[PDB]
Subunit: 311 residues, 5 copies
């Protein structure tokens, strides 16, 4: 078919609305997420307008093939929106009330720097390409934008589903395009962080620190090195729960610092033994005594430094 | 086509029924499950009613394109229900007897807190959007709701397939919707839990506890630390069988407690050695003697505490 | 179209036949397998019968849209059978000779208790729902049921492809259904079991047993505990080749027993050391001497016990 | 439509040709590979023959629905060939020149016994089922069989794409079938086998062998056993690069032999220590001295034995 | 339909243009990448020409079935381009302005030799097969070739999207083909390399080097061998971030060199101990003293050698 003719030099406003039925399958690595939702569209086609008295009925139900429907697409999707039309209703003035139920895999970038205290702002971009006969602009219908209460993304809290009312109108490949931003705000909700990442790593670190209450080089080497392997093993056990990223995480920084503390530990152990063997057990025990407090304090300061450096 | 005209101001009741042919592919991580089933629908369209004497036949077989069929959908599905119609039969009064065989990936949330003694209640939500001409309500036909005996979900026991007879009628995007809850109750059936998780972890823990029958710091460090690595390695070996969750499991708590017992073990070993070296082998052996009973008893109490705290 | 009218009160027998072109992608975890095969169907539709003299041709080739074809489905499949029709041939009496080439993912349960000496019996269930005009029953055409010689399922031996000639006729959702069982028997063929699972595990176990020819608690702890880690690491290396199951395997039981032998080993090592330190090296060496034979013999007996207990 | 009538009692030869556009996604585990290619077919349908003078044009372009095209399929494929027709050209004599661009997942068995020096011969089997009106035979058009120069299968060298000119004609399910073999020869080309598998494994093995230049049982146990774990760790690090197979590899055999050398090493270490403790340090050092040469030589011989036994 | 007839002996130029909407899912292993983009095509079909005065409209919107559209395909794709047409606009002269939104998985080869400082040049090959009536050639429309600013490929910097203006015209399977190269240049952006690969590996290596400040063979064996395991465990922890390749990487070479330094370390430790036991602690400490500087210096030189050898 053909688009509705203009009022006068003025473009066609299409009233959009997305209602989140089910939000799921968030891929922290791939920066994707799947959504099953309703897309409500509304425009005024005066060609379809009818007198309610002569026709007998107030709202006429139509098939998509019969009526002209604007070509709405999503900007940040992987493939076809896999949509099925729910209901088309034309009011006597010609205002079409479109509704479809779609399921799409959305590519929204993710920021794990503050992991696992980070919050993500998910984007759904709605696009419409203006044809040469008439120009098309998008709008937001606030009553038709929401989310179901039962929407669950395990490990996160679904804060708000909102949209940027003002569209981003720009020129692309010699034609006008109207873009709309649908923002899904989610905060992180890891409660087992401390009991299944930090706490057992802190134990493996403290165990190594008992070498400051020992003089046996053979036992100290065994402590610091064996606990280091224990730590790696543990880092492999939690490897899945950790985010694979080209940038440095907050948790990623803690982990690095642990590896630095194992090195500094070995330095001490090595020094304590070298001073003892080089007949100066005066300094050798002075250092080992300080290291009993120097290691915990410097660790707490360095952790306070990063926690401030990230937050 | 168009929906059947009403009796008088009263809505159209659609008699639903789901019969489970095959239930499979449960993703404990993604909280999904796949089901192959029959969907039986029944409504009264008086337009299709016919006299059995004049026509000659009692029940007329129809194609989906020919007849009006209500737009039934599933709320918690990943995509299109991938359905194929089995048989449409209209009785002389106009009662349509619909039947389809569908296969859908259902998103039902899972609760692993009581893992692996937890039970899950799986949801299948049936929805129908009322159009403006007439309002549609859903109902349950108890003879047409069941499950095949051969339905297997390995590692679980399929208890019951039932449905909430009373539908949840609510207003969404300016129109009425009727929702139906289909509940699939499954209990867990892990029998190799103890022989392939608890028992070998308890061995790795008891081995470490032999350091209470030893005075050699070099052998004690080797015992407690090497068994700790053994434990981590084992936790990596059972990592697959364990549930990845943002919350704390019952099994997840046991595991944590093990890591705490390794720490307390090291503390003892460290103390025993420090009192010996600081020329007081009176206290050093008093503690090591108590720790022979203090560790098993405190472990059994702390396990009784959690088992009560979860169940 | 409509089904062929009956002979007299008697149902329509549909002669089935499956010929395995390619059998592949067996998922030991998911209990699935993929198959590419021919499905041959044959029924007598007298409406299509023709005189060979008047028509000129003996067998008429038809399109699926033209002729009535029974609604045959598979019971235990994941989705649509993804079938394409090869050839439809009607003989002068009206006997239709249907043939299609399909590819389906079949859900057949698996039993790994006797792993890796277990044999599996794979099921393909053929179903046909009887409509109200006439009742439909299934039959097997023995010449049209076979398998290609080149059919390979790596790691297994394809024994036989057969079918239960007598169908399972039952009442479902107020209508008759005819079910047919197609059985694919496969035995296991793991030849590197012993060289890449048992043999290196038995070495890691024997190495630990050298602590019965040693008196050094420091070396004995190092032996038994370090070999225990070696064993876990090895169990992680073979973790992939091992079956993930909620029940206890034969190999799974051997593995458990190994972990129990490490514990009993430690008990001995601990006892030998405690008697030595407690000034009784008479008993301490008596036990270590017996353990040299007590451990191998009790291991061989306990393995003979399980091998009998499973087979 | 219907097939072309025969010349006289003689069958229809269909001239085939496959040209490899892109070859990719080889699954060493699943024994699959994906290919994007051109399929050129040519047969003589005299019904379509035309006079070039009267018609005006030399070659008539047709749609697949219009013309009869033989039902060509692939034997060893996973699903539908996902083909799109490029061009159909009929010459004045009636010789049809078919061309399609398909993408299929081919199941060709693989032989990793000589891994990673093994070569694979990939199969693409073309099939055509003869109908009752006329019998169909396949042929190869040597000018229409090739491969693109840019065809890359990383980690392999694409040697040759050829085909067995003589087809395999046989009887299946009461009808004739013509089969054609398309062979893709690829040799293995992993170059850092030695730097990333053999060389570091040989280091972990040599390190263990320093226990022949040592008398300390505590250090020898630590060497042989700790290096054994190091070896397992390393075998887990290269686990991905290794082929999962039910049969024994060449590399798989080397690996086994390493595990046997660790056992024999421990035996020596255990014996050396037992003779020393049993007051005979004459034999105890004689063995340790021989083992300095006995282990390298027996290793080189045993490796020469396997390298000969496989190649 | 049929292609537009020629001007005179001259081919039809099709003006192409690809605009990158979303670039994502890069598989470093499979050498694939997914792209969602606009494909703009323009050719002159004079058959479609029309008078704007008589028709009333300046540009006629058409359906793909109505008009002839050139058969454009991609050379290096996995399957069907999964395209949906956006807008077809014919000007009064007959110049068609085609536009589609496609999503395809592109196979472009990758070069990880300089990983993680490597740059990749991604290829998108456009192809059009000339039919016998008229020859088809491709061209590039520079205003219709670009990329969206929001295009993100995490861990890489999207430098430029350009195209080789001159097409590659060649003869294939007896007909002319026009090929166009679309180049996507990306450099790597790993910032967590040093903190999560090199730095912790360098710590595990330096720790081992403390054995040059020690004389205890028991502690030296424990250091060098236990740190070696630590290193393997760490190499398994970073195994994911490392590229699986048949060739040698820059990072892969560093890793190899580390394994060689562990071997040379053991040689030293073994030599130091053998000279001590063979009553020459003069040389034994001379070597251990030099190795304190010989190991760091030779490591820095060997790293400078490779960094120069790759860059």
């Amino acid at each position: 078919v053909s688009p509705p003719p203009p009022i006068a030099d003025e473009p066609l406003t299409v009233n959009t609305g997305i209602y989140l039925i089910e939000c799921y399958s968030l891929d922290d690595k791939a920066e994707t997420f799947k959504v099953n939702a309703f897309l409500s569209l509304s425009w005024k086609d005066r060609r379809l307008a009818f007198d309610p008295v002569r026709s007998g009925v107030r709202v006429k139900t139509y098939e998509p093939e019969a009526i002209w429907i604007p070509e709405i697409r999503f900007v940040n999707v992987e493939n076809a929106r896999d949509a099925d039309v729910v209901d088309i209703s034309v009011s006597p003035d010609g205002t079409v009330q479109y509704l479809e139920r779609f399921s799409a895999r959305v590519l929204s970038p993710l920021d794990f720097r503050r992991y696992p205290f980070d919050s993500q702002t998910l984007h759904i971009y709605l696009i419409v390409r203006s044809v040469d006969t008439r120009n098309i602009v998008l709008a937001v219908d606030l009553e038709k934008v929401g989310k179901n209460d039962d929407v669950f993304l395990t490990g996160w809290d679904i804060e708000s589903f909102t949209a940027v009312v003002k569209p981003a109108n720009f020129a692309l490949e010699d034609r006008l395009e109207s873009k709309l931003d649908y923002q899904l705000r989610i905060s992180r909700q890891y409660f087992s962080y401390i009991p299944n990442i930090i706490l057992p790593m802190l134990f493996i670190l403290f165990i190594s620190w008992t070498a400051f209450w020992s003089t046996s080089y053979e036992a100290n080497v065994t402590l610091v090195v064996s606990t280091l392997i224990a730590q790696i093993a543990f880092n492999i056990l939690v490897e899945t729960n950790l985010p694979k990223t080209p940038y440095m995480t907050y948790t990623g920084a803690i982990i690095f610092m642990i590896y630095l503390f194992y090195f500094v530990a070995v330095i001490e152990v090595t020094v304590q033994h070298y001073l003892k063997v080089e007949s100066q057990p005066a300094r050798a025990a002075s250092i080992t005594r300080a290291s009993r407090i120097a290691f915990p304090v410097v660790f707490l300061l360095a952790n306070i430094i990063l926690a401030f450096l990230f937050f």
